[PDB]
Design an enzyme around this catalytic site. Structure first.
Site, PDB file in Angstrom:
ATOM      1  N   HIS A  95     -57.554  11.427 -13.393  1.00  0.00           N
ATOM      2  CA  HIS A  95     -58.536  12.501 -13.365  1.00  0.00           C
ATOM      3  C   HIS A  95     -59.930  12.021 -12.946  1.00  0.00           C
ATOM      4  O   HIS A  95     -60.723  12.795 -12.412  1.00  0.00           O
ATOM      5  CB  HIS A  95     -58.584  13.167 -14.740  1.00  0.00           C
ATOM      6  CG  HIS A  95     -59.430  14.401 -14.789  1.00  0.00           C
ATOM      7  ND1 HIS A  95     -59.252  15.456 -13.930  1.00  0.00           N
ATOM      8  CD2 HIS A  95     -60.429  14.756 -15.633  1.00  0.00           C
ATOM      9  CE1 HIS A  95     -60.126  16.409 -14.220  1.00  0.00           C
ATOM     10  NE2 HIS A  95     -60.848  16.008 -15.247  1.00  0.00           N
ATOM     11  N   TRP A  96     -60.227  10.751 -13.204  1.00  0.00           N
ATOM     12  CA  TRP A  96     -61.532  10.176 -12.876  1.00  0.00           C
ATOM     13  C   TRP A  96     -61.560   9.593 -11.465  1.00  0.00           C
ATOM     14  O   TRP A  96     -61.758   8.389 -11.289  1.00  0.00           O
ATOM     15  CB  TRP A  96     -61.905   9.074 -13.868  1.00  0.00           C
ATOM     16  CG  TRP A  96     -62.331   9.552 -15.207  1.00  0.00           C
ATOM     17  CD1 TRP A  96     -62.372  10.842 -15.652  1.00  0.00           C
ATOM     18  CD2 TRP A  96     -62.796   8.738 -16.285  1.00  0.00           C
ATOM     19  NE1 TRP A  96     -62.827  10.879 -16.949  1.00  0.00           N
ATOM     20  CE2 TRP A  96     -63.095   9.599 -17.361  1.00  0.00           C
ATOM     21  CE3 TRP A  96     -62.985   7.362 -16.448  1.00  0.00           C
ATOM     22  CZ2 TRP A  96     -63.575   9.128 -18.580  1.00  0.00           C
ATOM     23  CZ3 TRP A  96     -63.457   6.898 -17.657  1.00  0.00           C
ATOM     24  CH2 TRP A  96     -63.748   7.776 -18.707  1.00  0.00           C
ATOM     25  N   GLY A 152     -66.746  16.769 -17.885  1.00  0.00           N
ATOM     26  CA  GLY A 152     -66.960  17.439 -19.159  1.00  0.00           C
ATOM     27  C   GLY A 152     -66.396  16.807 -20.423  1.00  0.00           C
ATOM     28  O   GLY A 152     -66.376  17.452 -21.469  1.00  0.00           O
ATOM     29  N   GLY A 153     -65.927  15.568 -20.343  1.00  0.00           N
ATOM     30  CA  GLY A 153     -65.368  14.906 -21.511  1.00  0.00           C
ATOM     31  C   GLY A 153     -66.417  14.694 -22.594  1.00  0.00           C
ATOM     32  O   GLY A 153     -67.612  14.857 -22.343  1.00  0.00           O
ATOM     33  N   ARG A 206     -69.101   5.626 -25.448  1.00  0.00           N
ATOM     34  CA  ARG A 206     -68.792   7.052 -25.436  1.00  0.00           C
ATOM     35  C   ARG A 206     -68.741   7.646 -26.842  1.00  0.00           C
ATOM     36  O   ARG A 206     -69.248   8.746 -27.071  1.00  0.00           O
ATOM     37  CB  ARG A 206     -67.465   7.309 -24.715  1.00  0.00           C
ATOM     38  CG  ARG A 206     -67.535   7.089 -23.208  1.00  0.00           C
ATOM     39  CD  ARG A 206     -68.334   8.186 -22.506  1.00  0.00           C
ATOM     40  NE  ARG A 206     -67.629   9.469 -22.467  1.00  0.00           N
ATOM     41  CZ  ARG A 206     -67.053   9.994 -21.385  1.00  0.00           C
ATOM     42  NH1 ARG A 206     -67.081   9.362 -20.215  1.00  0.00           N
ATOM     43  NH2 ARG A 206     -66.443  11.167 -21.473  1.00  0.00           N
TER      44      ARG A 206
HETATM   45  O1  LIG Z   1     -62.844  13.536 -17.667  1.00  0.00           O
HETATM   46  S1  LIG Z   1     -63.800  14.704 -17.754  1.00  0.00           S
HETATM   47  O2  LIG Z   1     -64.102  14.923 -16.290  1.00  0.00           O
HETATM   48  O3  LIG Z   1     -65.047  14.322 -18.522  1.00  0.00           O
HETATM   49  C1  LIG Z   1     -63.020  16.119 -18.479  1.00  0.00           C
HETATM   50  C2  LIG Z   1     -63.576  17.379 -18.325  1.00  0.00           C
HETATM   51  C3  LIG Z   1     -62.965  18.484 -18.894  1.00  0.00           C
HETATM   52 CL1  LIG Z   1     -63.652  20.058 -18.713  1.00  0.00          CL
HETATM   53  C4  LIG Z   1     -61.796  18.338 -19.615  1.00  0.00           C
HETATM   54  O4  LIG Z   1     -61.193  19.438 -20.178  1.00  0.00           O
HETATM   55  C5  LIG Z   1     -61.235  17.085 -19.777  1.00  0.00           C
HETATM   56 CL2  LIG Z   1     -59.773  16.938 -20.689  1.00  0.00          CL
HETATM   57  C6  LIG Z   1     -61.847  15.973 -19.211  1.00  0.00           C
END
Ligand SMILES: O=S(=O)(O)c1cc(Cl)c(O)c(Cl)c1
Ligand SMILES: O=S(=O)(O)c1cc(Cl)c(O)c(Cl)c1
Ligand SMILES: O=S(=O)(O)c1cc(Cl)c(O)c(Cl)c1
Ligand SMILES: O=S(=O)(O)c1cc(Cl)c(O)c(Cl)c1
Lengths: 284, 284, 284, 284
Positions: free
Chosen positions: A263-264, A39-40, A186
């Site tokens: 996170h990725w 969701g980034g 991006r």
């Molecule tokens: O890295 S992402 O998976 O695009 C991502 C998704 C969300 Cl919902 C979010 O709050 C952040 Cl900080 C990063």
């Protein structure tokens, strides 16, 4: 396998027409699998899963869906709780494609959508692979908002290349993955007015009366399928302590944690992620 | 592949002659791997790894070592802190077989020995796979002794078939794995005076001045190799909260958790365990 | 202050007449406080709070209620989910005694009832003090049933002195508190047909369709009042990892953990517990 | 009670003369208590404990010490591992003032020094009160460096008002505490060449070979005294998951967690903190 060749469109009904963009590959393969991206800002299916779709396609019929507000799917100014909204879109796509019970792969926001879908339409969801998923996670030790979420927010208020670069750098353990080209690509996608409208819409959706739909950790004990949780130990968006309620309450859960990973997960540990997913989904 | 055919012996020096029994298979294979079994009463290498040695042998040169006090290795009445003691035995075997740096696979007590070895002889240990390991684990939420450990202790004071059956039943999630034949086979091995001497020796070793050698969670931050932690969510001997310090402090750590799985990971989830081990150790 | 001098009765309506027994002290004092005891066999207000009622009465108007199925309260053969059932009883008592909004003190099962009461009648519950509470707790690491819950079930199936003593010994860190007099007194109360009737009712109520009312951890984020959670580090019934969801989601929560203390906090750490409660409820 | 009236100086020997500044109050009182402040830029005893010293003096003989590198204590260009270094300073002060065995109160870095002191001079340290302590804490879930530690490093590299204000805002739950006057006062103290000298020394000391003295979580199992751990649930410097090893391994530990409270417990929850400390040290 290219972006243009796999591209497909569908129109579904979520309180009116909604254009959904997705990618289709491995058409001849026996088992269908739906991928739901992160969701980034500027995120979309192809780039989210660039290191994975080709490999996964050899074993499965892959459907990588741009969630509403992202990619080439419709970017509405207003919507309800997001995961339910995206789930309704996905529910529509299922009926359209004539799908039965299908396994779902989702990271971060897409993880949240996958879970919301599995709860709302239980008969339609199979095995789950969830990488640092939102919604289903609840950070028992990390104060909210986390550092990752803060940098997302700062970009929304002030969408500059510098703030986006800052956001991307806390997505990963190996910061060299954040190349100048990636930031530029991006930022170009994220800074358009259509994409910025979508970002604001998300923020307002948090103030909704249907917020409780977001707190999926309260409900996933109802899940009967196998669920594979995958986490980066250094995830600064949805940190590792967020996995614990889900791991405990989902009867057939598994958890895999990568050290030296952010996170990725699907990018940073792409090989390890692919093989794990292929094995967990039956090897196809 | 049978028990008799793979059986081997060696004599090493740990403050005097020490007979070690082990099993050797996959002799022609490129990479050597050492397996270290669990510490329950009547436990030994072949039975501990029955569902794994054959499969692992296709990719690796396997050495499954009966730790001192177990199997057909010497069962001394007195020894120091156990993991160091078993490590010294293993150190001796390494030099004998001319081994360099070798990956170690150890569950429970064997996990503790694998780690103690890796700390004391850093140049000699490669990748680690540790299933519900002792020593390296510290139970941050579970009051000690855990229920599993209590049932071990009750057997030591009162070594009856009923107490052993009770002990074995908290080893596994699926209690049907505890068959009458298994209990009988284990009780026959566990109840002999040589094995009961070995059990008492272990208890006294806890009172030693070298107890701090047991608390490996204090030291594993010094480990430079990849380490795969594997846990059963329902492990009632070394419960899941015991993994956290190690997961945090070992730089190249991974963790895999199985839902609906107890302390005997390698048995209960034997297929999932095997493939994970093979992949993690390079696929051989 | 004696059991006899403080003894009181009331009849309320929960699907018909229901006798509630309670103890009343500090009648002249300004601030009312309700105590809700634990759920062990033979449990009742007086024995549960013997170390606290005298002290609390110096500052507060104390009401220690035997929950239905316990003490001298009605022991019905049939009832719904217990915490909601007992809360309904307590609501009736509130109205009879003319109470407004009152702080609640509850350990274990009584903690669950206190929380259940606070959720169902939000205007009527003030500050909460909860010791190793049931219901709001969820054991993120400890496999269920816990050692404590197992030994309770074993007694329920086979109500013998030996099994009750075994149950009692995992209630406390300091096992010397489990004296022969204590075992006999609890066993005598637990062994009566009326108490055995209540046990059957409790057992049957678990199979009810209203079970989700039991899972209060899903709901406590809605609590607006301060809540003081108190835990024994060595609690083997509701272990420490169970505090985490509540501590996180209750906005004005506090947590206090006593080392070298089991499930019976109000007994083992009675003085420290009293002072914390007295201070937390305003010093009266 | 003012900064001037309570101000005192002493010179001790830590590899040569070392000036220690401190504040003394409650001179006539029976029980001595030493306060050890936090490690932020511009930090010193008086501002750190402004909400506590007056109250504690009513019950105790209070000694609030500026640790070397802070306040009006010597700010050397070179020193070893800080907690051991500051402890040595404190040991010298103990001997000069003729103190025997004294309880210690320390938040953050001062908590680390208190613990370091208690380990190195066991006969000299009594009960410990530790608020979000460094050193004994280890963040089992939060990736390091934490959000707090990062913003401190950024200020150290680029000591600007903007960066200091950013640092200060992640110290507290209630950001209204971060007033312009506070930012200016801390920045003025932090921006002096002497304080900048101390920052360089602190930075260099991390590269020292005696770093393992910093990792006190490995050692606190040796503490024999009661230890009261106090944490803010929303602590973004030393987050709550960092309390777990200490709570577990310190035999007579207690933990108190305040909801809606950050890293500066003694400020944000000053009244609740004072009462807990006063009671814990015996009411004097
Ligand atoms: O890295 S992402 O998976 O695009 C991502 C998704 C969300 Cl919902 C979010 O709050 C952040 Cl900080 C990063
Ligand atoms: O299951 S086993 O792996 O044999 C096992 C090993 C040890 Cl060291 C232990 O304490 C218990 Cl309870 C069980
Ligand atoms: O000791 S008690 O607090 O009475 C207690 C209450 C319940 Cl509900 C329980 O399950 C157990 Cl094991 C003990
Ligand atoms: O606020 S303080 O307690 O002064 C503080 C001390 C240290 Cl050592 C630190 O690293 C940070 Cl970020 C804050």
């Amino acid at each position: 396998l290219t972006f243009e060749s796999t591209s497909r469109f569908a129109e579904v009904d979520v309180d009116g027409p909604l254009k959904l963009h997705y990618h289709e590959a491995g058409v001849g393969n026996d088992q269908t699998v739906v991928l739901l991206h992160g969701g980034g800002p500027g995120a979309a299916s192809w780039t989210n899963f660039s290191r994975n779709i080709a490999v996964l396609a050899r074993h499965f019929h892959v459907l990588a869906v741009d969630q509403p507000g992202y990619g080439h799917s419709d970017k509405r100014a207003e919507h309800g709780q997001f995961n339910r909204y995206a789930a309704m879109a996905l529910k529509g796509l299922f009926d359209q494609l004539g799908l039965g019970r299908v396994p779902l792969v989702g990271n971060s926001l897409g993880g949240g959508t996958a879970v919301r879908f599995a709860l709302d339409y239980p008969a339609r969801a199979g095995r789950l692979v969830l990488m640092g998923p939102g919604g289903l996670s609840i950070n028992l030790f990390a104060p909210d908002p986390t550092e990752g979420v803060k940098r997302l927010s700062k970009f929304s208020v002030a969408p500059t290349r510098e703030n986006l670069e800052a956001f991307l750098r806390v997505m990963v353990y190996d910061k060299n993955l954040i190349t100048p080209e990636l930031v530029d690509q991006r930022f170009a996608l994220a800074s358009t007015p259509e994409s910025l409208t979508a970002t604001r819409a998300m923020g307002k959706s948090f103030a909704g009366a249907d917020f409780e739909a977001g707190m999926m950790w309260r409900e996933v004990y109802r899940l009967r399928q196998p669920v594979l949780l995958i986490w980066g130990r250094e995830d600064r968006v949805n940190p590792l302590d967020g996995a614990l309620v889900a791991l405990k309450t989902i009867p057939r859960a598994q958890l895999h944690v990568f050290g030296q990973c952010g996170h990725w997960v699907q990018v940073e540990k792409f090989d390890e992620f692919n093989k794990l997913t292929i094995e967990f989904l039956g090897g196809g």
